[PDB]
Design a protein around this ligand. Sequence first.
Ligand code: FAD
Ligand code: FAD
Lengths: 488, 488
Amino acid sequence: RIVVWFRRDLRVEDNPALAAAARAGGEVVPAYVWSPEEEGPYYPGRVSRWWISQSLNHLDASLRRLGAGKLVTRRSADAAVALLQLVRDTGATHVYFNHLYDPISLVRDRRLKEMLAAEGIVVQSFNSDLLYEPWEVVDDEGQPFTMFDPFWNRCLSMPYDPPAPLLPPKRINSGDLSMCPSEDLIFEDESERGSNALLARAWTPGWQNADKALTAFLNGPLADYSVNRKKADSASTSLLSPHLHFGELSVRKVFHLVRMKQLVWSNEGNHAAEESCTLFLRSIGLREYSRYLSFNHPSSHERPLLAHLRFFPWVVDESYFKIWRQGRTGYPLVDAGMRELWATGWLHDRIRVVVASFFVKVLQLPARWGMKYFWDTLLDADLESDALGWQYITGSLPDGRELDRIDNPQFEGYKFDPHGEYVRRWIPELARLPTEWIHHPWDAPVSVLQAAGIELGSNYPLPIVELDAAKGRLQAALSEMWQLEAAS
Amino acid sequence: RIVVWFRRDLRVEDNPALAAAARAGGEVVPAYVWSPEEEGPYYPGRVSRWWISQSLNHLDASLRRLGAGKLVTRRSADAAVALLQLVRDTGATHVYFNHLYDPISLVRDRRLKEMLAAEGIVVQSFNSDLLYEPWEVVDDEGQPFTMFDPFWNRCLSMPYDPPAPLLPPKRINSGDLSMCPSEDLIFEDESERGSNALLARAWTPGWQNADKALTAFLNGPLADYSVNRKKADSASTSLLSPHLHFGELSVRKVFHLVRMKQLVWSNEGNHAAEESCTLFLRSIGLREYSRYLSFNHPSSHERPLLAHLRFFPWVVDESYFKIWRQGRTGYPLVDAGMRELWATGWLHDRIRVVVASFFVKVLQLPARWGMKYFWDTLLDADLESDALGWQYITGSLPDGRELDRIDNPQFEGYKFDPHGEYVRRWIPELARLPTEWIHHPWDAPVSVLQAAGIELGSNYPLPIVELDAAKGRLQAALSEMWQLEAAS
Ligand SMILES: Cc1cc2nc3c(=O)[nH]c(=O)nc-3n(C[C@H](O)[C@H](O)[C@H](O)COP(=O)(O)OP(=O)(O)OC[C@H]3O[C@@H](n4cnc5c(N)ncnc54)[C@H](O)[C@@H]3O)c2cc1C
Ligand SMILES: Cc1cc2nc3c(=O)[nH]c(=O)nc-3n(C[C@H](O)[C@H](O)[C@H](O)COP(=O)(O)OP(=O)(O)OC[C@H]3O[C@@H](n4cnc5c(N)ncnc54)[C@H](O)[C@@H]3O)c2cc1C
């Protein structure tokens, strides 16, 4: 009677589509269709595909234990085609899904509403990803916000709270789907299966593991988040991002659970933990703002993503891109993160800032290139969140980070790795190199680098581009961009 | 502006009156009116009066951290006269509270609404005690239930889940309270304050401690509630009893958290633990049924509580009552539990029936007598739930226990205390008595009693009333009454 279409909500708690299909009375057919060709350039990358293959298997058993035959797995190049074969094949009255906010889904999914409503299907879409809908939060003239601070300040002062997380169905009734077939989905090249499976050393995809990681963070490093959130040398953050990208966890549960921890800590005098919750919710609000930006000010053609860097003369150099991917740049904080991104599919947010800032400030390679690599290597590769991050580090946002400027690697090192233990964990070659030079080995005297057993150029690479050359080329590239910009 | 009248909702999370008042955007003056005169024969007990005063200081402290000036306290024989007087002193506009369901408050609250409306006061009441309101769960012809099982299975198949718990106010503001005065309430007589304080050996009243107790049960004995809920030789139940009576913990939060614990365990193959939450929610539902029976079938005069034994020949013997009070009855399980009741103001459910079944079926004293003792010595002294519990053991309603019948103590012991460790702990005199006789020492050979250093009559009392002489008396008292029954 009702189809529940899964997309990026691979959970069973607080899933309004599935919870309303079950409470309608009739049967519920839960299904997922793999239509990546519809995603154009944003076709899910290598390691994100490896997550879905485990997340779906994991969500299958969850569904089956609640009284389902299966999760129907359909394959297509058009989602409507596969979806309305299923409404026919499995003969339903309704199609329920929770609506997304990326520019691809926003118009593909309104082509589905009409396509399906022309063959008599009733369609309803629900909120599964945001505390507040993007249209629900505006300024005093009713307009979208343009910076993050006024926007998040509004959500924190909204006249109602984010809806409480719904319970899962008591059980779901699917009927006999012994008839209905499921297409064996292919997510992994045979050639890559053996290295993709090593991602499980660090991660376990699934609604169940997302829930255990949240109560692990809530009862652990959340109390110190106020003071440690920027450090990459301890597990200072929640490690929930891939779980949240695929919707395996409610953000409305996280909001509600964290607000309860705050009330208790406030009654215990734990003032530093109370601010920890304030700051961690802000990080949850940055995910809200990523959707708010892609909905209210989408990529257009009149003005694209990185539109302020149109006439920026990028260095085109595949050699440099190869050194960056391999973490052989010779900048230890960058190399350390590029090694961990390849090995685990994840990076602390500030190491993301470092590796991406280095990409467009020192090597000054097309940001597209690095945006694509991120898409193939991140387990939490998220359309709106990746766009917001690259927009932030390149200075397309007014909120964003300054354009005409390069970070001193010691500034990065002292903030995200003060004792150098992040570099030493991922680059053991430099273990015996003192903290004083571990983030800029090129500046150390030969005696100090010989004591550390480091030969810059054989044991560990030389700086592929020197800072002073990078800054000189950055001013020459921006002046080139600014004389060009006025010429229009 | 708004005045939040606290009664039996001593908590900040999922307090709809408080949440609604805070969300109005005005000012929120919290207050407690002490009017025990309005409860007549249900004047709050001795140890319940101690818990309240502990809980109020706890709640006042947490209110002030939220920004309130204080918790306003008023002493008057009539609630309304005090509630009116308060909003006169404050210039308030509204009076919010959460409605109760005992036959006293249902009528006193209702008159307050009309009385306060007349004087120009906006008044609204909210549900905070129950999963569903009683007038929502009816049979298929729309009439109230009369047995527990059909009621609870309708609550469990109800078309909508019980409302998820509300968030506490992020802040409350009340303005200037320096003229708004509060008169210190007196809950304890000076000569009993010391003896009362020792209740803190076993209980710390307060919503925070209710929260911590719930977290402790969920991560602890809840998994083993299916096989151990009857045992009293260990901490097998939640011990959330007095917290839930004073509304220190939202039952709706308990429901949602347990239901979600059920889902994770089911998915983990932990069937026993899954089964355990089923029974634990049933115990929550018994508290729902407690308000159902008092809302639908209240008792005053034509069928007052225990009307069926109107015609019972009660043994009016104040000597036997005192021996029951002091746990000197010679029945260990009875004496053990009677000590703990006086010691810690709490008793396990099954021990609540052992000392109660014994009070009316062995000593056969007025059930109204042992009712007033429970009222004075139970911290979780609850009008509706005490009503249900007595009706259960006396057989006053079809769900109840069989009347002409007396539990063999070894039956009780084997279900509630397999190794006799419960009474060894509360009656260390019997510590050396082997388990076989520990629940019936009078049937032991003198050689065994002396080997344990027991001498019935001097070391540990002789059974004040024998069982044979009591079921005999039971027949002679029941047919004398059925003879009186069919004679009118
Ligand atoms: C260049 C760049 C690329 C990024 N790409 C991604 C991406 O593909 N996917 C992604 O989820 N995040 C991305 N981010 C944001 C941020 O780096 C990650 O959210 C964070 O590192 C995930 O780790 P965590 O779960 O421990 O975060 P926590 O600190 O534990 O935060 C909790 C949750 O808040 C959300 N969140 C936190 N920071 C941000 C942020 N800046 N923007 C949006 N949501 C946020 C995430 O859902 C995260 O799981 C990117 C940032 C930059 C600068
Ligand atoms: C004679 C008699 C008198 C009672 N008097 C009271 C009383 O004054 N106050 C009171 O709250 N309960 C009363 N009960 C019910 C029961 O004994 C207690 O609720 C329970 O033993 C308290 O332990 P717990 O909180 O660990 O229960 P749990 O096993 O943890 O149960 C969870 C909660 O469900 C509720 N509950 C469980 N069983 C019952 C029940 N049979 N009836 C009503 N609610 C129930 C309680 O709120 C309890 O805290 C009485 C029972 C009897 C037989």
